[PDB]
Amino acid sequence: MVSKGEELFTGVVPILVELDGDVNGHKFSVSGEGEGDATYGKLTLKFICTTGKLPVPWPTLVTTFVQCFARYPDHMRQHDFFKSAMPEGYVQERTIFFKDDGNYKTRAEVKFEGDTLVNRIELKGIDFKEDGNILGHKLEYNYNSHNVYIMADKQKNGIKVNFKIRHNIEDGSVQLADHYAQNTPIGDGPVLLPDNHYLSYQSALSKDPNEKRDHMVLLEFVTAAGITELY
Ligand SMILES: [Br-]
Ligand SMILES: [Br-]
Ligand SMILES: [Br-]
DSSP: OOOHHHHTTSSEEEEEEEEEEEETTEEEEEEEEEEEETTTTEEEEEEEETTSSOSSOGGGGTTTOOGGGSBOOGGGGGGOHHHHTTTTOEEEEEEEEETTSOEEEEEEEEEEETTEEEEEEEEEEESOOTTSTTTTTOBOSOOOOEEEEEEEEGGGTEEEEEEEEEEEBTTSOEEEEEEEEEEEESSSSOOOOOOSEEEEEEEEEEOOTTOOSSEEEEEEEEEEESOOOOO
């Protein structure tokens, strides 16, 4: 049978993203809007910096900007923590360590407000080099494909996640961003605690030719894998 969480994602769902950020004292806010289609693992989102110029590169915020929209194959449905926590939601905590630079700490509350799936985020960045790849804006406006590794954390009724992002630097090198995370339900009800598996991501970044504010358009596809002889 289809669980209450799953049922909320059977069609296209509007998304609202709100972020308040402070990186080495540079304060900024971002709002985003778009839609998610969990059946296809598809996210289409446009983000605006509402405070002026974004003080870090857009690609460094991609991982922060709704894993409930991942496509879980039917055979892996019992491993979909994110949908099982809905509609009450879940809290994602991350630390993102930029190699030879600073770190972000993020807290995101992901929950429904009516028909809208909301991702409300606080981001704090410290210890950045004012002339490094992040504050010095040396990252290319593009994005590579990565796997995100998920394991159960029974003690916390949630999951622990880790992965490495490689951001292309303008000189042909790479800036590593090591992500460590936990996701835990907001509500007190049962959730699905998964076996080890991963999410496979691909992301494309673009610009709206009619948009004069600092912004990012994101197209992202996310599919669960790692757990699989009928043939
Ligand atoms: Br950028
Ligand atoms: Br891209
Ligand atoms: Br995560």
